[PDB]
């Protein structure tokens, strides 16, 4: 007997029209987090584990957990490749006390997202089997090279899981295998997953809101840190140049990529096996030599030397120009950002866009 | 970056000093003009180069 | 009612100028601003090619120019080509050997060039070194004044009190066919075209209203080219800056007085020689207000799926417009509530208003909260609004001459062949040997029927 | 709605030699074309918007934003501020050798963040499309490759088309940016007629690139070399720790404190 009277004017005079001013911070956000100059698992094999159990039908979020999960998964899949084309993805669904590898080890969002679209039709059935899921995953990761960061991300919806044997078998194996596992839980903290994640070197987090769900996923987009226990390798890599059918396709037959059915007349050949690949980067399914484009390498070098947060202040007390450096414009906002090194004037968009998207400060390049 | 050695080469300090001076002096003595903007001969010649059968 | 309902033929710049004489257009192209107005109105196809060709005096071959656009878009490029040539912008010149070279009218070329870069005149603009004017007028005061003036003209069509206008302007509203002369003394009355105009948006309204003024301009002895050039210079003017009436012909002075009375320009006094152009004049161009609430001023009609209209408007004019096609339910100080219904929309339809006018009228005035969605008007409303006219716009009338019951099929096939020969065939029935021909062929075919 | 962002290689070294060379084409004629081109962008559409930045040896100066004298407003005000800004920059010029490269990356960074503000400032009823036109004349400075590559991907993520016009000296980085961003790289063979190339290759709208027939994109060879002896590499070895490229196998990262675990 309180909801029709729950407005701010229920027991106040000024709240009759200042109610949305008193409760004005109702829907906003402001994303930022820390960083560190530590080794990163730039070569990344991340596998996604998603509950396929009846509990995924619950409406803890706006739509059922399944729809909200798949919605954010697609977005996460996109940015994961976008921020690391070198890495690869795979998906496993934990249904009927069993686990089904929705997607194999690959780096093609086309196939991965296509699988998601189709996976929207899945049937939430039975209880989850964390042991079966980790079995299929580890069985696959066993064959992956030690230097490639073998990681798994788990999305847990239920609280009870059917394991055919104590998961300590897998955790002891995973720890010895140096594989890393992280888990994202829905509405609750489970000891099983917490111990599993903390012991395995990953982290257990719980979803609060779709924004929090993105906030957590955002952290998993950045490559994990690496220790000296992982193989510090000197992996062989190919940088094949694109080659069209320039000579009227002469002595250059069109061919389908190892992964694709599209017969491409021009593209990237394998310097190791001369295979035809329409896209790059692509792993040589018939050689083991990975082929990567020179710009994709530089695309990740920001993680090696990222920017630092700029000095924030409510006013340009330093009395720089009335026009914000970088992007020209008036200091219309009573909050200013100043680079520690170059000390130029930066605005809200500069601190956000330059540090989170440009990753380079103009005055530091000078 | 991981780029091979370019064909870059420095000049003489005189050329640098003269470059800073000559360009400063040119920009001090400069005004926009339609004739300096374009000529039909230049445009047509450039159209030939850009034509569907051009170089 | 031998033909369909009278429609307000909205003729953009192309349709209007497309009928003018080349010398008139050449005189019009005399000013740089007139060229820019024409140029900016061109489709992006023409817009680029003209800019690309502006710096040449060599007749580029028709084929090479046409080969600048991809195979599939070359067909759409023909539209811009037909326009540029039809608008005298493109004139063919012959290359050695008679090849079809293309050249832009040098006057237009030179004025666009003088528009972009210095020329003998500095855009025909000057400050006259005068200081800040007496009784300074502010930009918002200019907008409101222009708005008030425009509202007064719309109010005059609505026939509301205090709508003060000159009889020559009231006459023009009747002369243009907007205010019907159904009664002596010209009491407030409106034609289908006038209602369509009332529901039309401000820029298209002002545009077509001024086109009617121009259609009567030489009947009124005003200078078409001069007024047009002046109007284009005004469209390229600035709100806050001052402009002078120095060196303006009496024809321009008469028009300027109308232009002032019309609220497109603000003057210190009718006799003053310095003025400030209003937002309406700067925005006076053949363009579109938008698919939702107007960019310049937001909409106020909250159209709802239950056909309920919640117009956050105080304006008796806007309210009275809503009453034309919708049944009004309540009047509240800050907002008005109404509902669209078959009867009220059939009133608009019977008054000769295409449902698209209502749809667009509501769209252009759709409250900003209704935005942020692809369809601003729910499909059910859009469909039923159209369905109401499609219910009662199935009967289509057409005046013609019928040829029937000939002596044989040879007569029918001969008359049909003659109708086909002259292209005067409207419709025919080959089973009963019936043919309908345009009325122009009435005498020709009636007399031929005696000869065949 | 569109926003053109012109970038001119305000390098006094090449332009000064070009001036000292007394060639048929000079910086004066160049800025004339730029101003006319800039005018054309705004002239082409009442709603179009434009910004111009000059990449100098030590500063990325905006050339917008126009003058208030009122002789002519739209084009004259823009041209006057442009002349004034280039004069201020080039007349009040210093002389330095320690840092002689053109601040290209900084200029591009300014443009990108400036575009970001503007596109946010624009209402969402209709959205501002944007593209950058880079007019390069001096040599391609490798020391900015890191920043250059990072800004390319930012433009890509921001869905911004980048076009480039190179005078004399070419650029692998800039041609690579055109390829990646989906723009176009062109080496102008007749610098005095620069403007005519601009009014046809770089002036057409994004919505018209697809409709016009233009010179096909030059295929860019992704030549790469390791930091060790800089030789060309088609197949090399990469440090999974720091991604430093080494042409041939070795025990330790010369680029960092890390001994490879070799087996
Ligand atoms: Zn291979
Ligand atoms: Zn800095
Ligand atoms: Zn290393």
Swiss-Prot record, chain A:
Protein family membership: Belongs to the GTF2H2 family.
Function: Component of the general transcription and DNA repair factor IIH (TFIIH) core complex, which is involved in general and transcription-coupled nucleotide excision repair (NER) of damaged DNA and, when complexed to CAK, in RNA transcription by RNA polymerase II. In NER, TFIIH acts by opening DNA around the lesion to allow the excision of the damaged oligonucleotide and its replacement by a new DNA fragment. In transcription, TFIIH has an essential role in transcription initiation.
Any one Gene Ontology cellular component term annotated for this protein: nuclear speck
The UniProt record lists the keyword Phosphoprotein: yes
Keyword flag Transcription: yes
Superkingdom of origin: Eukaryota
GO molecular function terms attached to this record: RNA polymerase II general transcription initiation factor activity; zinc ion binding
Gene3D superfamilies named among the record's database cross-references: von Willebrand factor, type A domain, Zinc/RING finger domain, C3HC4 (zinc finger)
Phosphotyrosine modifications at: 80
SUPFAM superfamilies registered for this protein in UniProt: Cysteine-rich domain (SSF57889), vWA-like (SSF53300)
Organs and tissues of expression: Widely expressed, with higher expression in skeletal muscle.
Mutagenesis / variant outcome for changing residue 287 to A: Reconstituted TFIIH complex lacks p62 and has no transcriptional activity
Phenotype for residue 361 to A: No effect on the transcriptional activity of the reconstituted TFIIH complex
Biological processes annotated in GO: G protein-coupled receptor internalization; nucleotide-excision repair; regulation of transcription by RNA polymerase II; response to UV; transcription by RNA polymerase II; transcription initiation at RNA polymerase II promoter
Residue span(s) of domain VWFA: 45-221
Mapped zinc finger ranges (C4-type): 270-287
Subcellular location(s) of the protein: Nucleus
Major location (coarse): nucleus
UniProtKB/Swiss-Prot annotation, chain B:
Reported modifications of this chain: (Microbial infection) Upon Rift valley fever virus infection, interacts with NSs leading to ubiquitination by the NSs-FBXO3 E3 ligase and proteasome-dependent degradation.
Domain of life of the source: Eukaryota
Location relative to the cell: Nucleus
Signal peptide: none
Chain's role: Component of the general transcription and DNA repair factor IIH (TFIIH) core complex, which is involved in general and transcription-coupled nucleotide excision repair (NER) of damaged DNA and, when complexed to CAK, in RNA transcription by RNA polymerase II. In NER, TFIIH acts by opening DNA around the lesion to allow the excision of the damaged oligonucleotide and its replacement by a new DNA fragment. In transcription, TFIIH has an essential role in transcription initiation.
Family named by the database record: Belongs to the TFB1 family.
Subunit structure: Component of the 7-subunit TFIIH core complex composed of XPB/ERCC3, XPD/ERCC2, GTF2H1, GTF2H2, GTF2H3, GTF2H4 and GTF2H5, which is active in NER. The core complex associates with the 3-subunit CDK-activating kinase (CAK) module composed of CCNH/cyclin H, CDK7 and MNAT1 to form the 10-subunit holoenzyme (holo-TFIIH) active in transcription. Interacts with PUF60. (Microbial infection) Interacts with Rift valley fever virus NSs (via OmegaXaV motif); the interaction leads to TFIIH complex proteasomal degradation.
Species this chain originates from: Homo sapiens
Shown residues in whole-protein numbering: 385 to 439 of 548
Curated annotation (Swiss-Prot), chain C:
Any Gene Ontology CC annotation: transcription factor TFIIH core complex
GO molecular function, one term: RNA polymerase II general transcription initiation factor activity
Name of the featured protein: General transcription factor IIH subunit 4
Record remark on domains: The C-terminus (residues 305-462) stimulates the ATPase activity of XPB/ERCC3.
Family from the record: Belongs to the TFB2 family.
Main location group: nucleus
Domain of life: Eukaryota
Protein encoded by which gene: GTF2H4
Keyword Transport: no
InterPro entries: Tfb2_C, TFIIH_p52/Tfb2
Compartment list: Nucleus
Subunit record text: Component of the 7-subunit TFIIH core complex composed of XPB/ERCC3, XPD/ERCC2, GTF2H1, GTF2H2, GTF2H3, GTF2H4 and GTF2H5, which is active in NER. The core complex associates with the 3-subunit CDK-activating kinase (CAK) module composed of CCNH/cyclin H, CDK7 and MNAT1 to form the 10-subunit holoenzyme (holo-TFIIH) active in transcription.
Keywords: DNA damage, DNA repair, Nucleus, Transcription, Transcription regulation
Gene3D superfamilies given in the database record: 3.30.70.2610
GO biological process: DNA repair; nucleotide-excision repair; transcription by RNA polymerase II
Entry keyword annotation includes Chloroplast: no
Swiss-Prot record, chain D:
Organism placement in taxonomy: Eukaryota, Metazoa, Chordata, Craniata, Vertebrata
Protein name per UniProt: General transcription factor IIH subunit 3
Oligomeric form and interacting partners: Part of a TFIID-containing RNA polymerase II pre-initiation complex that is composed of TBP and at least GTF2A1, GTF2A2, GTF2E1, GTF2E2, GTF2F1, GTF2H2, GTF2H3, GTF2H4, GTF2H5, GTF2B, TCEA1, ERCC2, ERCC3, TAF1, TAF2, TAF3, TAF4, TAF5, TAF6, TAF7, TAF8, TAF9, TAF10, TAF11, TAF12 and TAF13. Component of the 7-subunit TFIIH core complex composed of XPB/ERCC3, XPD/ERCC2, GTF2H1, GTF2H2, GTF2H3, GTF2H4 and GTF2H5, which is active in NER.
Domain of life (superkingdom): Eukaryota
Family the UniProt entry places it in: Belongs to the TFB4 family.
A GO BP annotation: regulation of DNA-templated transcription
Annotated keywords: DNA damage, DNA repair, Metal-binding, Nucleus, Transcription, Transcription regulation, Zinc, Zinc-finger
Positions of C4-type zinc fingers: 239-256
Role according to the record: Component of the general transcription and DNA repair factor IIH (TFIIH) core complex, which is involved in general and transcription-coupled nucleotide excision repair (NER) of damaged DNA and, when complexed to CAK, in RNA transcription by RNA polymerase II. In NER, TFIIH acts by opening DNA around the lesion to allow the excision of the damaged oligonucleotide and its replacement by a new DNA fragment. In transcription, TFIIH has an essential role in transcription initiation.
Subcellular location: Nucleus
GO cellular component, one term: transcription factor TFIIH holo complex
């Amino acid at each position: 007997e309180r909801t029709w009277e729950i407005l701010k004017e229920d027991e106040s005079g000024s709240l009759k029209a200042t109610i949305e001013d008193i409760l004005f911070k109702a829907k906003r956000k402001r994303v930022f987090e820390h960083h560190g100059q530590v080794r990163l698992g730039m070569m990344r094999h991340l596998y996604v584990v998603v509950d396929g159990s009846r509990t995924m039908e619950d409406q803890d979020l706006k739509p059922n957990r399944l729809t909200c999960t798949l919605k954010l998964l697609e977005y996460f899949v996109e940015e994961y490749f976008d921020q690391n084309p070198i890495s690869q993805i795979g998906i496993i669904v934990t249904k009927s006390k069993r686990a089904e590898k929705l997607t194999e080890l690959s780096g093609n969002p086309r196939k991965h997202i296509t699988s998601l679209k189709k996976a929207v039709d899945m049937t939430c059935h039975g209880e989850p089997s964390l042991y079966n899921s980790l079995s299929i995953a580890m069985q696959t990761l066993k064959h992956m090279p030690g230097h490639t960061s073998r990681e798994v991300l788990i999305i847990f919806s239920s609280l009870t899981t059917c394991d055919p044997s104590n998961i300590y078998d897998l955790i002891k194996t995973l720890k010895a295998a140096k594989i890393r596992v992280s888990v994202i839980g829905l509405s609750a903290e489970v000891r099983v997953c917490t111990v599993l994640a903390r012991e395995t070197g990953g982290t257990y987090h719980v979803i609060l809101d779709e924004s929090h769900y993105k906030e957590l996923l955002t952290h998993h987009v950045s490559p994990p840190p690496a220790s000296s226990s992982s193989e510090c390798s000197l992996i062989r890599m190919g940088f094949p140049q694109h080659t069209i059918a320039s000579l009227s396709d002469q002595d250059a037959k069109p061919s389908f990529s190892m992964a694709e059915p599209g017969l491409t007349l021009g593209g990237y050949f394998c310097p190791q096996c001369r295979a035809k690949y329409c896209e790059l980067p692509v792993e040589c399914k018939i050689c083991g030599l990975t082929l990567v484009s020179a710009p994709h390498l530089a695309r990740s070098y920001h993680h090696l030397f990222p920017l630092d947060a700029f000095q924030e202040i409510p006013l340009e007390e330093y009395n720089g120009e009335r026009f914000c450096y970088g992007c020209q414009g008036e200091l219309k906002d009573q909050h200013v950002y100043v680079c520690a090194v170059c000390q130029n004037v930066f605005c809200v968009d500069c601190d956000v866009f330059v540090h989170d998207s440009l990753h380079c400060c103009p005055g530091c390049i000078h | 970056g991981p780029t091979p050695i370019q064909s870059l080469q420095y000049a003489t300090s005189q050329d640098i000093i003269n470059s800073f001076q000559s360009i400063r002096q040119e920009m001090e003595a400069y005004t926009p003009k339609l004739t300096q903007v374009l000529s039909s001969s230049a445009a047509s010649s450039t159209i030939t180069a850009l034509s569907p059968g051009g170089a | 009612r031998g033909l369909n309902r009278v429609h307000l033929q909205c003729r953009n710049l192309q349709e209007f100028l497309g009928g003018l004489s080349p010398g008139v257009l050449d005189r019009l192209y005399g000013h740089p601003a007139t060229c820019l107005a024409v140029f900016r109105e061109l489709p992006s196809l023409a817009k680029n090619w003209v800019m690309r060709m502006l710096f040449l005096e060599q007749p580029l071959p028709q084929a090479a120019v046409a080969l600048w656009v991809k195979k599939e878009f070359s067909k759409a490029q023909e539209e811009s080509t037909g326009l540029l040539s039809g608008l005298r912008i493109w004139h063919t010149q012959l290359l050695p050997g008679g090849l079809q070279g293309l050249i832009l009218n040098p006057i237009f070329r030179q004025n666009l060039r003088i528009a972009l870069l210095g020329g003998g005149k500095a855009w025909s603009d000057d400050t006259s070194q005068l200081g800040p004017d007496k009784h300074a007028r502010d930009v918002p005061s200019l907008d409101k004044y222009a708005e008030e003036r425009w509202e007064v003209v719309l109010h005059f069509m609505v026939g509301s009190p205090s709508a003060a206008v000159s009889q020559d302007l009231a006459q023009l509203l009747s002369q243009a066919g907007l205010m019907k002369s159904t009664e002596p003394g010209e009491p407030p009355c409106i034609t289908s075209a006038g209602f369509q105009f009332l529901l039309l948006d401000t820029p298209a309204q002002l545009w077509y209203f001024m086109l009617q003024y121009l259609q009567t301009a030489q009947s009124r002895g005003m200078d078409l080219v001069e007024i047009l050039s002046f109007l284009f210079q005004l469209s390229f003017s600035t709100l806050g800056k001052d402009y002078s009436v120095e060196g303006m012909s009496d024809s321009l002075l008469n028009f300027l007085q109308h232009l002032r009375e019309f609220g497109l320009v603000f003057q210190r006094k009718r006799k003053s020689r310095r003025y400030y152009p209003t937002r309406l004049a700067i925005n006076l161009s053949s363009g579109v207000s938008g698919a939702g609430g107007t960019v310049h001023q937001p909409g106020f009609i909250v159209v709802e799926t239950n056909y309920r209209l919640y117009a956050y408007t105080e304006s008796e004019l806007q309210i009275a417009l809503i009453a034309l096609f919708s049944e009004m339910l309540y009047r509240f100080p800050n907002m008005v509530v109404a509902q669209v219904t078959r009867e009220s929309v059939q009133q608009a339809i019977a008054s000769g208003i295409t449902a698209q006018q209502i749809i667009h009228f509501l769209r252009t005035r759709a409250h900003p909260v209704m935005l942020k969605q692809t369809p601003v008007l729910p499909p059910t409303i859009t469909d039923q609004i159209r369905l109401w006219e499609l219910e009662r716009d199935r009967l289509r009338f057409t005046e013609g001459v019928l040829y029937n019951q000939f002596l044989s099929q040879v007569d029918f096939e001969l008359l049909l062949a003659h109708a086909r020969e002259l292209g005067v065939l409207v419709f025919e029935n080959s089973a009963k040997r019936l043919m309908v021909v345009t009325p122009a062929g009435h005498s020709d075919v009636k007399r031929f029927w005696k000869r065949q | 709605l569109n926003l053109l962002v012109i970038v001119v290689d305000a390098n006094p070294i090449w332009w000064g030699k070009q001036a000292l060379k007394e060639s048929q084409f000079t910086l004066s004629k160049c800025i004339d074309a730029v101003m006319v081109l800039g005018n054309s962008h705004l002239f082409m559409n009442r709603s179009n918007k434009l910004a111009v930045i000059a990449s100098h040896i030590q500063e990325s100066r905006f050339l917008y934003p126009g003058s208030k004298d009122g002789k002519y407003e739209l084009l004259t005000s823009a041209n006057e501020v442009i002349v004034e800004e280039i004069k201020d920059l080039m007349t009040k010029s210093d002389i330095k050798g320690q840092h002689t490269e053109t601040l290209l990356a900084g200029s591009l960074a300014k443009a990108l963040c400036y575009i970001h503000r503007m596109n946010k400032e624009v209402k969402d009823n209709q959205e501002m499309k944007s593209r950058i036109l880079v007019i390069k004349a001096a040599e391609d400075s490798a020391l900015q490759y890191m920043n250059f590559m990072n800004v390319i991907f930012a433009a890509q993520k921001q869905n911004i088309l980048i076009d480039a016009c190179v005078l004399d000296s070419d650029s692998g980085l800039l041609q690579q940016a055109c390829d990646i961003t989906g723009g176009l790289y062109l080496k102008v063979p007749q610098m005095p007629s620069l403007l005519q190339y601009l009014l046809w290759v770089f002036l057409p709208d994004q919505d018209q690139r697809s409709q016009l027939i233009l010179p096909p994109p030059v295929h860019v060879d992704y030549r790469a070399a390791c930091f060790c002896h800089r030789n060309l590499i088609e197949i090399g070895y990469v440090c999974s720790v720091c991604l430093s490229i080494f042409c041939n196998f070795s025990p330790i990262c010369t680029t960092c404190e890390t001994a490879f675990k070799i087996s």
